[PDB]
Design a protein around this nucleic acid. Structure first.
Ligand SMILES: [K+]
Ligand SMILES: [K+]
Ligand SMILES: [K+]
Ligand SMILES: [K+]
Ligand SMILES: [K+]
Ligand SMILES: [K+]
Ligand SMILES: [K+]
Ligand SMILES: [K+]
Ligand SMILES: [K+]
Ligand SMILES: [K+]
Ligand SMILES: [K+]
Ligand SMILES: [K+]
Ligand SMILES: [K+]
Ligand SMILES: [K+]
Ligand SMILES: [K+]
Ligand SMILES: [K+]
Ligand SMILES: [K+]
Ligand SMILES: [K+]
Ligand SMILES: [Mg+2]
Ligand SMILES: [Mg+2]
Ligand SMILES: [Mg+2]
Ligand SMILES: [Mg+2]
Ligand SMILES: [Mg+2]
Ligand SMILES: [Mg+2]
Ligand SMILES: [Mg+2]
Ligand SMILES: [Mg+2]
Ligand SMILES: [Mg+2]
Ligand SMILES: [Mg+2]
Ligand SMILES: [Mg+2]
Ligand SMILES: [Mg+2]
Ligand SMILES: [Mg+2]
Ligand SMILES: [Mg+2]
Ligand SMILES: [Mg+2]
Ligand SMILES: [Mg+2]
Ligand SMILES: [Mg+2]
Ligand SMILES: [Mg+2]
Ligand SMILES: [Mg+2]
Ligand SMILES: [Mg+2]
Ligand SMILES: [Mg+2]
Ligand SMILES: [Mg+2]
Ligand SMILES: [Mg+2]
Ligand SMILES: [Mg+2]
Ligand SMILES: [Mg+2]
Ligand SMILES: [Mg+2]
Ligand SMILES: [Mg+2]
Ligand SMILES: [Mg+2]
Ligand SMILES: [Mg+2]
Ligand SMILES: [Mg+2]
Ligand SMILES: [Mg+2]
Ligand SMILES: [Mg+2]
Ligand SMILES: [Mg+2]
Ligand SMILES: [Mg+2]
Ligand SMILES: [Mg+2]
Ligand SMILES: [Mg+2]
Ligand SMILES: [Mg+2]
Ligand SMILES: [Mg+2]
Ligand SMILES: [Mg+2]
Ligand SMILES: [Mg+2]
Ligand SMILES: [Mg+2]
Ligand SMILES: [Mg+2]
Ligand SMILES: [Mg+2]
Ligand SMILES: [Mg+2]
Ligand SMILES: [Mg+2]
Ligand SMILES: [Mg+2]
Ligand SMILES: [Mg+2]
Ligand SMILES: [Mg+2]
Ligand SMILES: [Mg+2]
Ligand SMILES: [Mg+2]
Ligand SMILES: [Mg+2]
Ligand SMILES: [Mg+2]
Ligand SMILES: [Mg+2]
Ligand SMILES: [Mg+2]
Ligand SMILES: [Mg+2]
Ligand SMILES: [Mg+2]
Ligand SMILES: [Mg+2]
Ligand SMILES: [Mg+2]
Ligand SMILES: [Mg+2]
Ligand SMILES: [Mg+2]
Ligand SMILES: [Mg+2]
Ligand SMILES: [Mg+2]
Ligand SMILES: [Mg+2]
Ligand SMILES: [Mg+2]
Ligand SMILES: [Mg+2]
Ligand SMILES: [Mg+2]
Ligand SMILES: [Mg+2]
Ligand SMILES: [Mg+2]
Ligand SMILES: [Mg+2]
Ligand SMILES: [Mg+2]
Ligand SMILES: [Mg+2]
Ligand SMILES: [Mg+2]
Ligand SMILES: [Mg+2]
Ligand SMILES: [Mg+2]
Ligand SMILES: [Mg+2]
Ligand SMILES: [Mg+2]
Ligand SMILES: [Mg+2]
Ligand SMILES: [Mg+2]
Ligand SMILES: [Mg+2]
Ligand SMILES: [Mg+2]
Ligand SMILES: [Mg+2]
Ligand SMILES: [Zn+2]
Lengths: 104, 83, 99, 208
RNA sequence: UGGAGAGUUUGAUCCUGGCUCAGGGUGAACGCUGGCGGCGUGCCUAAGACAUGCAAGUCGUGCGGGCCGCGGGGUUUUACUCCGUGGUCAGCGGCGGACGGGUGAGUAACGCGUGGGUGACCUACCCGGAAGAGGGGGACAACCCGGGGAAACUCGGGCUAAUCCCCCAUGUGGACCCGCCCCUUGGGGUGUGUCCAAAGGGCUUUGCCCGCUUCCGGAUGGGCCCGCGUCCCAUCAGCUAGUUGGUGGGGUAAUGGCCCACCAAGGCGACGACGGGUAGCCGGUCUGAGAGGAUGGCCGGCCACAGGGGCACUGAGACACGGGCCCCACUCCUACGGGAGGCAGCAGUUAGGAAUCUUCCGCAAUGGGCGCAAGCCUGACGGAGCGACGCCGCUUGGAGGAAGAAGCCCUUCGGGGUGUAAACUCCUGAACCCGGGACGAAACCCCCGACGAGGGGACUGACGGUACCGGGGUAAUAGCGCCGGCCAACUCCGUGCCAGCAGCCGCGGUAAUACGGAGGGCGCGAGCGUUACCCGGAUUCACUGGGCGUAAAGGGCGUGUAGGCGGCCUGGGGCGUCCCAUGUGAAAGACCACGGCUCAACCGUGGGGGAGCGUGGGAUACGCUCAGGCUAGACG
């Protein structure tokens, strides 16, 4: 079956394309403890129909571009930046570990 | 085309083939599509030839082309015996 | 040395030529009809579009285009012509297009 | 290369008597009568308390020196026994006891196991009517071990099979002395055998 | 059904802790030794370089010719010219040359594995179904004539056949544009317009056969896409401009920045981007009680590559190992202009290396290509050869009998040992130019039948005179390591911190079971040792299964970011978790059973298990999430 994944829209800055952050949980192959892993997907959005905080269902689709093989199958629940913010902060976090660094 | 032939499986001087259904282009002892019999050229045992005739019939019904020796054995097990 | 199956190379060149030539015609006629269609000249734009259609299919009769390469061509051709005739066109000769 | 060397000297080193000559290892000459002590310039000196390893090693050497098998083949059998279902100790002794050359010895067709070995190699023996010249051939229950007709009239086979008249045979075997036939009734149980061997020590030796 | 530990820090002890050994393994190599056979296996280094031969052709039932030959015709005769037929040569044309065979360089990646997607696709030959093949026209080799080059090879001119190429027709049908309907990414139906078919050949020639055309489907094979999984370094922390997305176009069988034009300013990263190192991945293999570790030779699957780089042509299929073009490096021929090459195919040579084989036999069998067939090709394959390289089997004797050794070589000088051991008596009978002698091989073909089903029939074996059977018949290779402890086996002489041994602890300085020799002994035996490497023991990277006061180890202290973890009660959802059914989990291997070769190794048949993922159904205690509530934590 074409794959269906659920994630949060963390990016809307593209024409007809939104970035969907999908989370996945699973026991660690050797240490057992359940660990959360995740991947960002570039789903296709023809009508600019979705915005941030939107939890959608991504569906496996025929390639729309390089780096883009999924379409937004539907909205699960609207607005909720608790997730977007989370993502964003972790990103802002990076703005540190290097030669300089913020203060957070 | 897809064929029904023999695949060597015995040992040196101890041949034992498998009546097989594979693409004509594969190694002979290569990866077949389906085993449908087996043959012991030297009849070292009373069971030196078996052939899932129902299956042999299937493959032939869809284009399987038997080797001559393949056909010969299949016939010996009445794959064509319409009598 | 001397592998007589260089006759294949020998032959490929003759084929290469045959194909090569059929395509030029196709390309040249297509451009020609697309050019006329655009300039609004309808009756002749179609007339030629029609030749191109025929030539294309024939190209696919043997191993020049074959497959759905022919279909793409005719498709894109009948596409651009019908559209370019959106300059008050009115399919005069109603050649290949089925309005 | 089945050993081949002085034998009534292994018994001496092994403390116990290994009948590796059948005859003579009975007479007042098996040496175990006069010189039961190990061979060599130190055979009589005071003994030194053997090591756990020593005990296990000697015990393995005893059990294996009896059937006169190679350490290679001997080991092969033991491994096969560990793998089989059933108490390794016994199963192992069963397999050992199933070697044709051995069975030929149990039926009395020959004095010693060594002699019985040669009798197989030379085709004087027959399993189910077909010749079998492999001393290691594994006899199965029901198989009838015999003497090739052509060999039946051999001077040795006579004196030998004669000496077996009215003589007892292991419960898992059975021989018709006249026709010179014999049947392997079934695998002997630990109880059926009575060897100067604690096979448990052997299992341990191959556990190290 | 499964799990052993030992030596070594001290005067002694306990602990910590490293080193080391006992076990199993290897495509091995080296030393001493070496008899037979079966089955396996053998360039691990220079993807270095290669002489030579062979490794892909096949169709005369698609076509026309040349050379050589025989026969028969038209004449009164000759010349000239017509037909038939044989050998041979290539050419035109077709199918194959994209498979089969080699290798592991590159690659850390949708390459591989596993499970899925394609309404985004192709598939020669094969199979099933439907429909069809009317008419005309053209050219280029061969061949003929001439020109250029040293050669390779090449330029021009003329003639000609076809299942070669083209035109018109017929339109079962199919393709494209537009509309409509049903479906839902480009799936299917429908209407109008437009566009598109074909090749002939063979006869037991008046019907059969081989073949051709269009279409729908089957089968097999394949492209592309996606989830998850896939080594080391963070002494690599930021990376990116076709770079991320858009619109239009190009290109393909087809999706896609695959490519292009234009627009937007995005994309990726600590869940490790980018960079560096290393490496084909897998089924499996070795080891381990298991978890795990290590590995990927042989065999099967996938990928990649064909002297190094780039490229496309022809094709159903290639960007093509024995096709083509250009650049490079190198070898070769050269009349210096210019040409010819590519063993990572079999075998062989040379180089490198500790090290890896025959320039073998056969096409008989299995399999592949072409052919109507006969048959042709097939270094694929089936076999033999060489190498204890591995595994298995086997032999050097069996039964009876204690000379007894200048010297080897023990002693209490009484004796003890080698030892039933003994070219010495009886038995069997490995070897052995001695008789017979194989399965593997019955098809294609032919005839009858109806070229069907059936049924009869010529033919054909490399291995091989091999195996195996029967006869006769000789008593007929033994070596290597070790003997202080770990670790099975002790004495004499020699030597005197020397000569030397040594895995670790150590041994030798004049009584040495530790050096060398000898007798004796232990282990294993056509082998035995050594070196190297892998797993083990090592709970010594500890998930199973460890630690940090003084043994190595608490950060100098805090603050808090990400993250990890989260009190009590109820409800929803059902992600984690658990259960059921189902698909998948190739073969080989492994395990069990039975079976074939006298056994075994080896092999055949059958059986059982199986995690992971997909699908459908179900459960809700715990974890998660949403909602509500509490007050024992927290804070005020
Ligand atoms: K940054
Ligand atoms: K001429
Ligand atoms: K129409
Ligand atoms: K088809
Ligand atoms: K298909
Ligand atoms: K596919
Ligand atoms: K586009
Ligand atoms: K295992
Ligand atoms: K593995
Ligand atoms: K690996
Ligand atoms: K054929
Ligand atoms: K004989
Ligand atoms: K002798
Ligand atoms: K001295
Ligand atoms: K000594
Ligand atoms: K180790
Ligand atoms: K410190
Ligand atoms: K510090
Ligand atoms: Mg947007
Ligand atoms: Mg050809
Ligand atoms: Mg032009
Ligand atoms: Mg057992
Ligand atoms: Mg210590
Ligand atoms: Mg010490
Ligand atoms: Mg100390
Ligand atoms: Mg000390
Ligand atoms: Mg002290
Ligand atoms: Mg220790
Ligand atoms: Mg030698
Ligand atoms: Mg061999
Ligand atoms: Mg190599
Ligand atoms: Mg080389
Ligand atoms: Mg040849
Ligand atoms: Mg001719
Ligand atoms: Mg020819
Ligand atoms: Mg290949
Ligand atoms: Mg590689
Ligand atoms: Mg890298
Ligand atoms: Mg995948
Ligand atoms: Mg083709
Ligand atoms: Mg058809
Ligand atoms: Mg003509
Ligand atoms: Mg010419
Ligand atoms: Mg000309
Ligand atoms: Mg044609
Ligand atoms: Mg119609
Ligand atoms: Mg037409
Ligand atoms: Mg005809
Ligand atoms: Mg596009
Ligand atoms: Mg397209
Ligand atoms: Mg293509
Ligand atoms: Mg790009
Ligand atoms: Mg490499
Ligand atoms: Mg372990
Ligand atoms: Mg195991
Ligand atoms: Mg392989
Ligand atoms: Mg090379
Ligand atoms: Mg290249
Ligand atoms: Mg093409
Ligand atoms: Mg090629
Ligand atoms: Mg390639
Ligand atoms: Mg080549
Ligand atoms: Mg070679
Ligand atoms: Mg050298
Ligand atoms: Mg052949
Ligand atoms: Mg063939
Ligand atoms: Mg052996
Ligand atoms: Mg003596
Ligand atoms: Mg004797
Ligand atoms: Mg005699
Ligand atoms: Mg026969
Ligand atoms: Mg007939
Ligand atoms: Mg017949
Ligand atoms: Mg033939
Ligand atoms: Mg005899
Ligand atoms: Mg000892
Ligand atoms: Mg000295
Ligand atoms: Mg001394
Ligand atoms: Mg010494
Ligand atoms: Mg460990
Ligand atoms: Mg732990
Ligand atoms: Mg510790
Ligand atoms: Mg200290
Ligand atoms: Mg400390
Ligand atoms: Mg502190
Ligand atoms: Mg926090
Ligand atoms: Mg909680
Ligand atoms: Mg939480
Ligand atoms: Mg709840
Ligand atoms: Mg659930
Ligand atoms: Mg399952
Ligand atoms: Mg399997
Ligand atoms: Mg058997
Ligand atoms: Mg067996
Ligand atoms: Mg099996
Ligand atoms: Mg489920
Ligand atoms: Mg519930
Ligand atoms: Mg609940
Ligand atoms: Mg609450
Ligand atoms: Zn004795």
């Amino acid at each position: 079956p074409k794959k269906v994944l659920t994630g949060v829209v963390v990016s809307d800055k593209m024409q007809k394309t939104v970035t969907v952050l999908v989370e996945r949980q699973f026991p660690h192959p050797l240490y057992g403890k359940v660990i959360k892993r995740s991947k960002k997907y570039l789903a296709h959005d023809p009508e600019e129909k979705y915005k941030l905080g939107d939890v959608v269902e991504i569906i496996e689709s025929r390639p729309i571009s390089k780096r883009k093989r999924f379409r937004v199958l539907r909205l699960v629940e609207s607005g909720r930046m608790d997730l977007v913010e989370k993502y964003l902060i972790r990103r802002q976090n990076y703005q540190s570990l290097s030669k300089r660094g913020g203060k957070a | 085309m897809v064929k029904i032939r023999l695949a060597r499986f015995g040992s040196k001087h101890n041949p034992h083939y498998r009546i097989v259904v594979t693409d004509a282009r594969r190694k002979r002892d290569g990866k077949y599509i389906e085993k449908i019999g087996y043959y012991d050229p030297r009849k070292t045992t009373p069971d030196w030839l078996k052939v899932d005739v129902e299956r042999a019939r299937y493959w032939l019904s869809v284009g399987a082309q038997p080797t001559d020796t393949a056909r010969r054995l299949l016939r010996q097990a009445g794959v064509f015996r319409q009598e | 040395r001397n592998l007589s199956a260089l006759k294949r190379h020998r032959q490929s060149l003759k084929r290469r030529l045959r194909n090569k030539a059929k395509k030029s015609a196709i390309k040249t006629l297509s451009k020609k009809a697309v050019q006329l269609a655009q300039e609004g000249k309808a009756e002749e734009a179609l007339k030629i579009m029609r030749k191109a259609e025929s030539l294309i299919d024939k190209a696919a009769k043997g191993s020049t285009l074959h497959k759905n390469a022919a279909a793409r061509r005719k498709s894109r051709l009948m596409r651009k012509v019908r559209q370019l005739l959106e300059a008050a066109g009115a399919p005069l000769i109603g050649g290949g297009l089925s309005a | 290369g089945r050993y081949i060397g002085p034998v009534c000297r292994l018994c001496r080193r092994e403390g116990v008597k290994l009948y590796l000559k059948g005859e003579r290892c009975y007479s007042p000459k098996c040496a175990m009568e006069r010189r039961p002590y190990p061979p060599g310039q130190h055979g009589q000196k005071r003994a030194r308390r053997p090591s756990d390893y020593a005990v296990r090693l000697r015990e393995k050497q005893k059990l294996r020196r009896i059937y006169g098998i190679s350490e290679r083949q001997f080991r092969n059998l033991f491994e096969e026994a560990s793998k089989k279902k059933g108490v390794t100790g016994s199963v192992f002794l069963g397999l050992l006891e199933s070697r044709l050359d051995n069975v030929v010895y149990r039926l009395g067709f020959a004095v010693s196991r060594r002699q019985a070995r040669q009798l197989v190699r030379h085709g004087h023996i027959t399993v189910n009517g077909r010749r079998v010249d492999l001393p290691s051939y594994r006899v199965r229950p029901g198989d009838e071990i015999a003497v090739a007709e052509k060999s039946r009239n051999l001077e040795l086979i006579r004196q030998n099979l004669e000496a077996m008249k009215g003589r007892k045979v292991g419960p898992w075997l059975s021989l018709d002395v006249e026709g010179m036939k014999g049947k392997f009734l079934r695998l002997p149980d630990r109880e059926d055998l009575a060897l100067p061997v604690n096979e448990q020590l052997v299992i341990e030796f191959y556990s190290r």
